[PDB]
Design an enzyme around this catalytic site. Structure first.
Site, PDB file in Angstrom:
ATOM      1  N   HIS A  45      -1.007 -31.363 -71.775  1.00 23.69           N
ATOM      2  CA  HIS A  45      -0.669 -32.405 -70.811  1.00 23.69           C
ATOM      3  C   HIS A  45       0.788 -32.835 -70.924  1.00 23.69           C
ATOM      4  CE1 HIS A  45      -1.498 -35.642 -73.979  1.00 23.69           C
ATOM      5  NE2 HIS A  45      -0.388 -36.080 -73.411  1.00 23.69           N
ATOM      6  N   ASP A  89      -6.748 -29.279 -74.335  1.00 26.93           N
ATOM      7  CA  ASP A  89      -5.440 -29.909 -74.180  1.00 26.93           C
ATOM      8  C   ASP A  89      -4.533 -29.393 -75.287  1.00 26.93           C
ATOM      9  OD1 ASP A  89      -3.339 -31.502 -73.414  1.00 26.93           O
ATOM     10  OD2 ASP A  89      -4.203 -33.365 -74.191  1.00 26.93           O
ATOM     11  N   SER A 182       1.030 -38.101 -78.524  1.00 25.78           N
ATOM     12  CA  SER A 182       0.422 -36.888 -77.968  1.00 25.78           C
ATOM     13  C   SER A 182       1.139 -35.620 -78.426  1.00 25.78           C
ATOM     14  CB  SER A 182       0.441 -36.941 -76.437  1.00 25.78           C
ATOM     15  OG  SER A 182      -0.368 -37.994 -75.931  1.00 25.78           O
TER      16      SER A 182
END
Ligand code: OHH
Ligand SMILES: *[C@@H]1O[C@H](CO)[C@@H](O[C@@H]2O[C@H](CO)[C@@H](O)[C@H](O)[C@H]2NC(C)=O)[C@H](O)[C@H]1NC(C)=O
Ligand code: NAG
Ligand code: CO
Length: 226
Positions: A45, A89, A182
């Site tokens: 992402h 992801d 992330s």
């Protein structure tokens, strides 16, 4: 990182700071880690039009002689990355050139698909993410110790899948990975096992991490071909 502590500068030499330029709006950042001199593992992402990786940093707004900045020439998002289920992801980034290995810049290996990390043990994650819901990303690299939870602890997350994701962070504590972290790695006993993927917008643990072991074959394929 919520409720963590500032890392001792350069103590996590595999950490990569990613500056992403979106084909359309403000720039953004993510974490990631060097698995090979010219490859960085992160979250799918975090993909964008272009990405610059900074290795050897602590305070990301203060350049050091330990710094090695490299442009990404190829983005390898997992073919099955799905925005609805948020499964898979994960993404590999190929760097323009190989980084030089120094005390401040080093690689970290990825685990075998056979090695399935079970719930219960303590791990740690580091990142330049926000330190609060209303706080900006941290200037300095932070880290926090989080508990690997039973997948049931993450049932409130749509499509959570124990075989593909890790449920991280005791929900009865505020410590947790958060926005900006992330792509950053989760280390358990010094070995990478997860990648910060997503969580609640209000920053309450547990958070969802991609289970790296599940993607070893895919990772090896990319490395073989590049
Ligand atoms: C408000 N939030 C948060 O504040 C947040 C809380 C977290 C809590 C624990 C651990 C990690 C966390 C990461 C984030 C983000 O916003 C990430 C981030 C930014 C932009 C798109 C992203 C797409 C997938 C995964 C992370 C993403 P970031 O870290 O890249 O910026 C998060 C709440 C739950 N999310 C979604 O339903 C979601 C899913 C698909 C999407 C596809 C396109 C655009 C937005 C999207 C949002 C993600 C944002
Ligand atoms: C991270 O690095 C920046 C840049 O060096 C620091 O920002 C400066 O902070 C000093 C504190 O000595 C101030 O005197 C300057 O006015 C600041 N300038 C800029 C460019 O913003 C920042 O404080 C550092 N953060 C830490 C150590 O947590
Ligand atoms: C995501 O997976 C869902 C649920 O299995 C499926 O319906 C969809 O086709 C996938 N996303 C896309 C459009 O690739
Ligand atoms: Co230094």
């Amino acid at each position: 990182i919520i409720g963590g502590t500032e890392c001792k500068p350069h103590s996590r030499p595999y950490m990569a700071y990613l500056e992403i330029v979106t084909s359309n709006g403000p720039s953004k950042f993510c974490g990631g880690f060097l698995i090979r001199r010219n490859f960085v593992l992160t979250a799918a992402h975090c993909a964008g039009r272009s990405i610059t990786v900074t290795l050897g940093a602590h305070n990301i707004t203060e350049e050091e002689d330990t710094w090695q900045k490299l442009e990404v020439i190829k983005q390898f998002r997992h073919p099955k990355y799905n925005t609805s289920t948020l499964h898979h992801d994960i993404m590999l980034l190929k760097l323009k050139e190989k980084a030089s290995l120094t005390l401040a810049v080093g690689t970290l290996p990825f685990p075998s698909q056979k090695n399935f990390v079970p719930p219960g043990r303590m791990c740690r994650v580091a990142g330049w993410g926000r330190t609060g819901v209303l706080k900006p990303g941290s200037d300095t690299l932070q880290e926090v110790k989080l508990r690997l939870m039973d997948p049931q602890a993450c049932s409130h997350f749509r499509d959570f899948d124990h075989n593909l994701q890790l449920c991280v962070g005791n929900p009865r504590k505020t410590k947790s990975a958060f926005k900006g972290d992330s792509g950053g790695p989760l280390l358990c006993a010094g070995a990478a096992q997860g990648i910060v993927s997503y969580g609640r917008s209000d920053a309450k643990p547990p958070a969802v991490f991609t289970r790296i072991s599940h993607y070893q074959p895919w990772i090896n394929q990319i490395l073989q071909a590049n």
